[PDB]
């Protein structure tokens, strides 16, 4: 299908929503996740290049959305 997953949010035995980072394709093991202002989903900090919590007031976009804004030639 045109979707690897229906949503990057699964459910565990506890029924809790386990987030799946659309970057490395790994779930949240209780680490600091960053939510894109575009995707809104929760991505892992190391995979996106984050080492701590930045000002929430400041807008931030994941390597996909931040790229879709800057734009590449076409490679």
């Amino acid at each position: 299908g045109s979707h690897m997953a229906m949503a990057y949010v699964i459910r565990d035995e506890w029924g809790n929503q386990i987030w799946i980072c659309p970057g490395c394709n790994k779930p949240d093991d209780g680490s600091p996740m960053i939510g894109c202002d575009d995707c809104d989903d929760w991505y892992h900090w190391p995979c996106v290049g984050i080492m701590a919590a930045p000002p929430e007031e400041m807008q931030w976009f994941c390597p996909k959305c931040a790229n879709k804004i800057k734009k590449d030639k076409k490679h």
Binding site: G30, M33, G35
Partner: peptide, 12 residues
């Protein structure tokens, strides 16, 4: 930017 640390099982 929305950030959250669910490391409630860590001392830091």
């Amino acid at each position: 930017a929305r950030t959250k640390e669910t490391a409630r099982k860590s001392t830091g």
